[PDB]
Design a protein around this ligand. Structure first.
Ligand SMILES: C=C(C)c1cccc(C(C)(C)NC(=O)Nc2ccc(Cl)c(O[C@H]3O[C@H](CO)[C@@H](O)[C@H]3O)c2)c1
Ligand SMILES: C=C(C)c1cccc(C(C)(C)NC(=O)Nc2ccc(Cl)c(O[C@H]3O[C@H](CO)[C@@H](O)[C@H]3O)c2)c1
Ligand SMILES: C=C(C)c1cccc(C(C)(C)NC(=O)Nc2ccc(Cl)c(O[C@H]3O[C@H](CO)[C@@H](O)[C@H]3O)c2)c1
Ligand SMILES: C=C(C)c1cccc(C(C)(C)NC(=O)Nc2ccc(Cl)c(O[C@H]3O[C@H](CO)[C@@H](O)[C@H]3O)c2)c1
Ligand SMILES: O=c1[nH]cnc2c1ncn2[C@@H]1O[C@H](COP(=O)(O)O)[C@@H](O)[C@H]1O
Ligand SMILES: O=c1[nH]cnc2c1ncn2[C@@H]1O[C@H](COP(=O)(O)O)[C@@H](O)[C@H]1O
Ligand SMILES: O=c1[nH]cnc2c1ncn2[C@@H]1O[C@H](COP(=O)(O)O)[C@@H](O)[C@H]1O
Ligand SMILES: O=c1[nH]cnc2c1ncn2[C@@H]1O[C@H](COP(=O)(O)O)[C@@H](O)[C@H]1O
Ligand SMILES: [K+]
Ligand SMILES: [K+]
Ligand SMILES: [K+]
Ligand SMILES: [K+]
Lengths: 350, 350, 351, 349
């Protein structure tokens, strides 16, 4: 009755996020321009760069999805749209030179209907995107989609534990998306108290997925290009970015001047305005960054430099060999520029 | 023995911002979980919220509106013995609502308690700075002897020893919290306290052996803190600042810099005690929030979402099964929204 | 092959006031009835555990007198001539037989300065140096005990049990603890040296208690609860600089800035203090005007009584031997202060 | 194998602000301690200070002034081969002073070294972002063969394995620091680094088994961080930001908000390299006046720290000094606190 070991273990676990750690440099024979950044998600899915633009109404529509795929990445068309209008976006990406494209779908009554229209437009992956991927409703929906479409790429999320990954994998998902609470615009951890520090979530989830040969997506909480290197080194095959893309020219929306420079709307899909309700995100603005190619060049540039530092010729080597070292707040403050007034902003550091 | 000398600095304590709730398998949607809670057979709440017994939080108006939302209001004691009984009668005659009243450890304790009993109080709150004192113990023992079936809520404590003492004195409910209050300076002027999450857990650990519920009182700033407080062992939470700005709290609206505010002060501040001193609280202001129903709705909404993430169909499952993970300051900064300029405030996040 | 000091370089861990809280315990005693008296030596006993630091912006004659009349002690600083310090000592003693101390450095004329101070009937000399664990201090302690066998000798500053042992065997009957915590101090920034003050107080009290010798917890106390923690860590008495520097009896006058009154407060290792090529170990600043010393002492003694009440301590020896701490994170400290509410009025004990 | 999978998050690292030095018994007065240091028999310094090889820190006037203070300046490599050999010659002509020069791992690296040796350079710094790479190792091995008596400082590194490899390639001094720089963004944009205090200690642990010194390069904001670096194992420290504001640094002064400033930027920044992907930023630091005044405060802090540690010389500090770890609250206790600062101190801003 009172035997319960769960009571004494409540505060046992410990979690790390990007700003808690650094990558330990290692012997390198390979130059950053020489490393390989390709990644294989499935038999039918493979990215030249391990970057995906989030399926949010302020980040990824067709224009973003086309530019992402042209960079070697992938864009997830968001679902705050009609089924008719979302299938229309997917085809536009497909007829534009054989580009890859993904589309977001929820766990709803009309989900399979939406999925039917998406397969008709030749989408390469559907994203079964929910706030709590570790639920029977997601589980049953993955199983439902897999029975009708045995060869369709299914990305299921979001989860943050090894048990949740195993469940989604056994339900039929071929890619698992990791991240509960880390988002730049996300308040889930504050209003519900729920989450796992993102780097520990990647490691714990990839640890389980590794046993099934299934890739993991690190989704959210990435603020600099160095965070992407940590996430890939923590076990994930690919990262999903929201904030770092919302200011790019191809994302939906126009430019507005705020505090003298150009800005674009960036808001969570669980925010009040996006849902038009106890919300789990906010609405905001990120600086305008210009064309997507410039942001992607800096992102890949940081990944190439990071891989050079770790002697990792490809991302698999980085996943299996890279070591981290933990630091305190004083480590983080030493790691950023410090004790100097920054005069010009770098393409890398705002 | 040098046992007390060698153990001075061994203990470690956690507060709300040190931890997150680990997601778990869920078969339940937020709209279907139960938020009801039983403090005693004659004291049952449909929502796990009590409005603090302070002169800027709970009078009759606050107690009635709290009771209609399914919660409980503690009418504060900075008034005459009779006017407190009228407020009690006003609530009881206002639809048979549950209502509580604060009592101190003083000479006129029994007269006031007698007047509250004649008015049909449903619980008295023996409210003191140091619940683990012989004066509290003696008075609880004295009150249980006169009223063997009256609900007695005693506090405040923060150790298993203090909880065990008050339970053996006769209190059916133990209130936990030394120093975490938003307006509180006890830990700064006196150096004394325990981080509230460890305190709730330490006290609940002892209280669980007796089948005695505990209240998490003070330090809750967002709806997610309540989920952690209930997940750490508390049956119900008591809030001061989260309620002080609502329409039903005592006090007119104050106008500051063109906006609406309400006075909020500790019962140990200079201003509250005049109705020389060495205070343990401060005097302040919180923004006006409107009607109580909206704040409760956001609070319950966040709890419901949290229970869904933790797979908790009821609060008992949350108490016995929810697990935490500890995080650094870097983890807390990842948990809030970050690196985006916030445009509009959310109903959930000011 | 033995690499023992090499492998131990980063082993130790230290705590200060903002890292910990005092754990409340069973109490039968009301704050208004606790005893805050403390005995440093047979000839030096204080009714309240408070000493004003020997700095030229904190303690001169008026400050030591108001401190003594409250049951505490004032250390008159040595940034004055020998004659002028002896006159200041004389003024305190001729002002009702009050206790008074005086700071002395390790110099050639230290013995000369000490001769004049003892003649003026000083109650304690404070052998004040930056690095109490040095041969010059020790030999000077040994030299003064030989000439003045019944003289109260306070020696500092130190931060280790070993340093405590050395000064005690040299002959000091009181040891003063604190390397770098001072509000105006930069020793740890410019020199890289120090020990977190709560760890320093506990480590030195661990050694000094074996000899039956008290320690003074000196510096780093910013709020009244910090005094409770330091006494709970083993100190008989605490020494304060900034919390007293703004008081009426402190030397210096009040300046007005932005409508509020301030007083100058500077480290004795600051440029200005050495003025009346230099690598200082302090800075110069201002603290708020606080009015008469009695109000500050009342909040200070009042906060301590509240703390001892929470700890069930009828006397300060009980607090020293029994009080327990719990460690907390930065998030613990943010919860401990007032938070998430706009503070409207200034509290008498919280600014 | 899961061993590497399992060991990803085992290590822990400390930086300057995580620690304090524990005072120890002193029989030595601060003004009598020795701050002389020996990097090699042909390279001996009166003070353990080296000015970084950056285009905003060290040119000829800086290196001459560093040597005259008892230190050393590394002439930066963002100039032509002739322009760098000429500056090395200029320092030598100013009284037989010591001077060092930075070289990259490039095709024309050997050509530049030949000119620096003809100018009688005392040490070359084979300076790279990732010293633990085959290109550096191969470049070090051939330089040791051609110039067997040349002082070779190779960097940068942050692990013992990297230190051991650079020593086996032939370098007599190892330079430690990946990411601690005030103008550095490597750890943010590449995700890679080792907290500078742990990196110095890890590298000094390995180098000392060979009798090889290490230079603690970067991350020093106050003179007490320097005492920590030497107590953590480095023979000498290298500074960029604490030296760029002096009169002798390259360039002139700009006026900002009523005060005087000097440009300070990383060598991996856009401006120094001029699509590029930077690992540094561009900035400004306050003007400080002559080098002698900044050095005086720095060595003064070193003397005080050694005294507190009872270290009569720097060897004793390296072999005996102890640390104690502290949290952010200790660090806040360590700085001035709860007092409004009125006047600027010569060593604390
Ligand atoms: C990205 C975010 C955060 C997000 C994005 C948009 C909207 C939301 C809202 C604010 C609506 N928040 C939740 O929806 N919160 C939530 C919490 C717990 C559970 Cl258990 C839950 O429902 C689960 O059960 C359903 C079937 O299994 C499926 O919807 C699954 O999410 C939902 C969140
Ligand atoms: C909510 C707070 C904090 C509070 C609320 C109102 C007033 C106070 C003030 C500032 C007046 N502070 C105390 O009152 N401080 C205190 C401290 C230690 C002890 Cl030991 C103590 O007395 C205990 O023993 C007595 C006999 O049982 C009983 O009164 C019990 O409080 C009181 C605090
Ligand atoms: C409150 C402070 C910090 C303080 C107060 C006044 C002046 C100073 C200055 C700025 C002058 N700084 C030192 O004086 N720094 C220092 C550092 C190491 C040593 Cl080892 C040292 O000397 C020791 O040895 C002598 C006896 O042999 C004796 O002077 C003793 O302090 C002095 C500091
Ligand atoms: C002070 C800094 C940081 C620095 C200074 C100047 C320029 C750079 C730039 C921005 C150009 N960034 C790199 O250069 N990043 C880098 C990352 C990984 C590797 Cl593996 C790498 O190259 C290694 O392989 C080469 C052959 O040995 C050799 O150059 C060695 O460094 C370079 C950094
Ligand atoms: O409103 C929301 N609440 C919680 N998470 C969200 C919300 N909107 C987007 N997200 C998540 O946050 C990620 C983007 O995070 P970012 O890259 O840190 O800006 C998305 O890919 C989603 O996984
Ligand atoms: O003035 C006081 N000093 C210390 N604690 C107080 C004082 N007044 C109320 N409290 C406690 O602090 C809590 C404040 O709740 P909060 O605003 O939610 O943090 C109250 O519910 C009491 O338990
Ligand atoms: O300039 C100095 N440098 C370092 N420490 C000092 C200096 N002057 C005074 N102190 C110390 O700091 C204490 C006061 O610190 P406070 O009470 O925190 O302001 C004094 O009693 C001395 O121990
Ligand atoms: O642009 C760069 N990126 C990264 N590190 C740099 C760059 N430029 C110089 N450094 C390093 O930073 C050191 C100076 O750092 P500081 O003394 O802390 O400001 C130099 O000695 C180099 O090791
Ligand atoms: K840096
Ligand atoms: K977040
Ligand atoms: K508080
Ligand atoms: K300090």
């Amino acid at each position: 009755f009172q035997s319960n070991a769960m009571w004494e273990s409540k505060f046992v676990k410990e979690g790390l996020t990007f700003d808690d750690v650094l990558l330990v440099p290692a012997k390198s024979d390979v130059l950053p321009r020489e490393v390989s950044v390709k990644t294989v998600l499935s038999e039918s899915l493979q990215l030249n760069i391990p970057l995906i633009s989030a399926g949010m109404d302020t980040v990824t529509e067709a224009d973003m999805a086309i530019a992402m795929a042209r960079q070697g990445g992938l864009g997830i068309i968001h679902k705050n749209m009609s089924i008719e209008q979302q299938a229309e976006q997917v085809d536009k990406v497909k007829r534009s030179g054989g580009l890859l494209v993904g589309a977001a779908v929820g766990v709803t009554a009309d989900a399979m209907t939406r999925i039917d229209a998406l397969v008709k437009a030749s989408v390469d992956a559907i994203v079964l995107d929910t706030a709590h991927g570790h639920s029977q409703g997601v589980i049953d929906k993955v199983k439902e989609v897999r029975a009708k479409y045995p060869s369709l790429n299914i990305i299921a999320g979001n989860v943050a534990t090894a048990e949740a990954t195993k469940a989604l994998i056994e339900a039929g998902a071929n890619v698992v998306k990791v991240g509960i609470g880390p988002g730049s615009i996300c308040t889930t951890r504050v209003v519900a108290g729920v989450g796992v520090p993102q780097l520990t979530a990647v490691y714990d989830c990839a640890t389980e997925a590794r046993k099934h040969g299934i890739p993991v997506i690190a989704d959210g909480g990435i603020k600099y290009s160095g965070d992407m290197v940590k996430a890939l080194a923590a076990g994930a095959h690919v990262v999903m970015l929201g904030s770092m893309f919302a200011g790019v020219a191809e994302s939906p929306g126009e430019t507005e001047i705020y505090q003298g420079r150009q800005f674009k709307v960036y808001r969570g899909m669980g925010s009040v305005g996006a849902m038009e309700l106890v919300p789990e995100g906010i609405e905001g603005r990120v600086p305008y960054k210009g064309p997507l190619a410039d942001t992607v060049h800096q992102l890949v540039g940081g990944l190439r430099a990071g891989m050079g530092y770790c002697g990792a010729q490809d991302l698999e080597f980085l996943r299996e060999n890279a070591q981290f070292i933990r630091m305190s707040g004083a480590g983080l403050l030493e790691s950023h520029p410090h004790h100097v007034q920054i005069t010009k902003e770098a393409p890398n550091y705002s």
